[PDB]
Amino acid sequence: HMSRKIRDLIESKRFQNVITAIIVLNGAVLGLLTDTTLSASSQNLLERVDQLCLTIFIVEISLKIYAYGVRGFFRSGWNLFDFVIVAIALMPAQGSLSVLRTFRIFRVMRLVSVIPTMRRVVQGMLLALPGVGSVAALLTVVFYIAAVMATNLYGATFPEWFGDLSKSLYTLFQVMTLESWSMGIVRPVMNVHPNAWVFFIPFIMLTTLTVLNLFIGIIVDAMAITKEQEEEAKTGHHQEPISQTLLHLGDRLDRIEKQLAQNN
Amino acid sequence: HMSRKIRDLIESKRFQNVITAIIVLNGAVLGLLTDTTLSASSQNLLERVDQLCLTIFIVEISLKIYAYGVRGFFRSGWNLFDFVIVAIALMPAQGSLSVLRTFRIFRVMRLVSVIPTMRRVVQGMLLALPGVGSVAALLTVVFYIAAVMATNLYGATFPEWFGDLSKSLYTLFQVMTLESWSMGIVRPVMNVHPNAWVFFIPFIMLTTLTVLNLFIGIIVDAMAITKEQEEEAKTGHHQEPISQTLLHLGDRLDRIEKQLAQNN
Amino acid sequence: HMSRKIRDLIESKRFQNVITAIIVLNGAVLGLLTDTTLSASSQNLLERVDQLCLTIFIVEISLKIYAYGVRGFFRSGWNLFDFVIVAIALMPAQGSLSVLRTFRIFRVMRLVSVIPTMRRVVQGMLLALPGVGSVAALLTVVFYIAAVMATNLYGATFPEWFGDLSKSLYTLFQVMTLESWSMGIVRPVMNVHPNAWVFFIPFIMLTTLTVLNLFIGIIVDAMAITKEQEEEAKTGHHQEPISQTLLHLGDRLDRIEKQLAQNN
Amino acid sequence: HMSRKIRDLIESKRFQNVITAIIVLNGAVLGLLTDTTLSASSQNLLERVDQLCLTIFIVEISLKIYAYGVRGFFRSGWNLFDFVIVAIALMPAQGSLSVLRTFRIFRVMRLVSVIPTMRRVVQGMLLALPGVGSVAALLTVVFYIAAVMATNLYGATFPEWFGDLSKSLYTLFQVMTLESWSMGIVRPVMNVHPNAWVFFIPFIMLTTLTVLNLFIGIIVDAMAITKEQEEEAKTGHHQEPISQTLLHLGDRLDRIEKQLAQNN
Ligand SMILES: CCCCCCCCCC(=O)N(CCO)C[C@@H](O)[C@@H](O)[C@@H](O)[C@@H](O)CO
Ligand SMILES: CCCCCCCCCC(=O)N(CCO)C[C@@H](O)[C@@H](O)[C@@H](O)[C@@H](O)CO
Ligand SMILES: CCCCCCCCCC(=O)N(CCO)C[C@@H](O)[C@@H](O)[C@@H](O)[C@@H](O)CO
Ligand SMILES: CCCCCCCCCC(=O)N(CCO)C[C@@H](O)[C@@H](O)[C@@H](O)[C@@H](O)CO
Ligand code: NA
Ligand code: NA
């Protein structure tokens, strides 16, 4: 019964609270370590607290692997994420895809995986992504076409902003966010190219509409997924859609119609 | 019957109108007192009008405490708020948590507590907060991780904007609001750190999405709570949800099905 | 039958098209008159076209007053608006509440009153205003409290932005719109008052939320009112709410329950 | 059976994938051609790859015209668009309505027409436009009235921003987007015209509300149209509205009421 006694401990509220308190503590020490003025002894102390925090996470994950099984633990995405986050910190010479995994503060993302209500918010957002993939692709297509056009049109006269494809993608993102789009970019561009507005004004109209569509699509779907997940976590099931309720109401009416026309 | 005669006065439309007119008058005199050019006599006069306004609020709250009872009055959050707002002004040497309670203009917040339709708007907003707590926590987590990262990454080269955790939290809030994010912050940062966009562009994408989710969540829930509260204030009850209407419609169909299969 | 023959002309599509074409023509000549470089003869010609346009509107409104009756015409807000717009132009020495009614281009607002689909959009927006009055009042209260606070706190050190109540209302509106709020206003203010963010960041959080609530409230209600008005204009009636459909469905079930329990 | 064998090839997933891969390849070579530093041989090579890509699109469209028929192919808007996009590239001396069709990168818009999920997003957006035409017209009317007013009011003192109708339309679009509206435009204008805020603040209030209404109207309708189109593409039909489900439920209740009152 040892593994079962350990699962009862792991799945308890107090154990979740201890682990949450250690993530907050680890997050607090990493925040204090951003302070350049600190003494060597103060830094050494905080680095030992970070070591103590990480060790508690190793015991916890090992306690989880034994109480669930290697395949049973890695079955959940949140468990694998927690494993990767902790295991990465135990690698001195590491390699990913950017530069170096020196951002230890990403360990505070564990607050999301450990707290179930927070876990459900991220879950809802992630599950809402496939449904907006075509809107996001449409926005990606518009950005690329615009970046190529802006490079060819304005790159030779405005090389800081449109000198290459990378530079144009960056200033088009800025233009889309409406940040200094006119006083900083388009009015100076119009001094050399007077009809530049025929490009930037339709670019703004299209991208702000498409990006708002993308964001609304995520928020609307994510809110409904999380709402359903909150219901299943509390009652064991979620509220059935209006269409299903009306379908079952229609079936009951077809059943009474049969028990009236011939056998009545 | 004295306390009952006083409640009939307190709960009347005319009494509410008199108190509203005194809050507007007190608000108007505090606004005139912002004028530095005013004579000593004009300031003295307006300060006596503020004293007269506050005295009317003391009589009103005392009239309320007697007509409801100490425990009956303090049972409502709006009554306690009105009590605190008025009582605070009668304290010369006060202490809270900031610097000093010299902002007497917060007395105009009583317009919200005294006007029931306005009271319902704030009520709807306040009751909508627990439901967005996890989205707000997710935004708080993202801000903290980002602030620590920005301090470590850019603090030594950009100390005005990222020199410490407090400075980084402030400029990340600015970046999230899209205010001069590129012309003022990220283009100057990219001159020293060319890949800074890999940090700021995903930061903007994530936070604008999460903050919009937080705001939409508040507005959608608050509007429904206020709508229900407006219905209960006018008719005594609110409109039942579609799910409940369909549930009772389903019960009526189960009742007629029973009165058809066997006893018919 | 003369008045009835005139109403058939007035209410026709062709007459509406002629009047629309004259508003567009009048709008086009007023736009050409903004050009400072024009000759005296060109200006004189366009001013005569504006005179011809206005005369057509006088004949039209007079044709409407006779075919409906003085009280019958003025019964509609759109007819009174059309009357005021045209009649105002026939007054040389006029007085309203601002400076002078020299903005003749407001005559292009008649495109809204003459085109029924456009008339319904404005109608929906106007009818949606009472329902957001308390949200708008809440925003007005927050602005006033903030303006008084900003005047007292920052007026002596920042008189251009906060020197008086009017100046503070203006820069708080700018701060609410997020326009240069940090690089232009709050960072310079924080150089003198380091804790200024404790005021401006909660001000931004509260006002952007309240203004979004105000706008969403208008758009959601206006869209539903216009939708109903579009239905009534095409079919003579609008779609009944789901609550009413379920109410009548419930009444039919109560009727069959009565015709089953006792008399069956 | 030749035309039928060709349609089976055209309508297959693999053929769609080959054409998609060629659009991506053509898009990639046009993006590489924005690079000014490239050698003459590298440019020549990429220009031949663009020629090869375009030739594959000619074979594909010709294969489509034969397998469907001239009138059958041109029956679809997407086929005509694909035809125009490819055929335009085979014209050396061309003329449209702007300057010159040198933006070959518009060929990447074929990703939208070739991918059905992407085709449905654009379809939903395009079909949602007639329904917002009156809101867009209302915004067009407000812009024109404002542009004429701004030209007459501020053109002589601010000719860069309001010197003519075109200049005023441009800076009003900027003001509507809230870009440097106060620090860049209205504060400098108020130094000469102190009551300029009476014009710009109501202009901002009205246009941001109307533009948000326009965008929300597009997103809400487009999302529902695309959702219905996604359902019809997968199952052959779409989900019926709640109103229709309740209508058929009401008809079933009227049918059982008839089979109870007289013949029971
Ligand atoms: C969905 C939209 C996604 C937009 C993504 C844009 C990223 C492109 C940014 C990039 O790759 N750069 C090159 C990195 O080497 C940045 C350039 O803009 C940079 O060269 C200039 O800004 C310099 O002037 C540095 O200040
Ligand atoms: C959810 C997001 C919440 C963001 C909240 C950010 C508040 C942090 C602001 C703060 O604590 N500061 C230190 C107060 O002492 C402000 C600093 O940014 C300030 O030191 C610099 O701006 C100076 O250069 C003054 O001009
Ligand atoms: C719901 C929010 C509503 C906000 C409305 C704000 C309007 C207040 C503007 C006003 O009354 N002013 C005084 C008009 O005399 C404008 C001042 O701001 C002005 O004195 C300064 O800006 C000068 O420096 C001129 O450049
Ligand atoms: C729904 C709203 C639609 C707004 C559309 C606005 C377009 C008008 C722009 C235009 O026609 N211009 C004239 C083109 O010749 C641009 C001017 O603004 C330009 O003359 C000045 O900006 C110069 O100073 C150049 O820097
Ligand atoms: Na903005
Ligand atoms: Na800005």
Ligand code: NA
């Ligand atoms: Na700016």
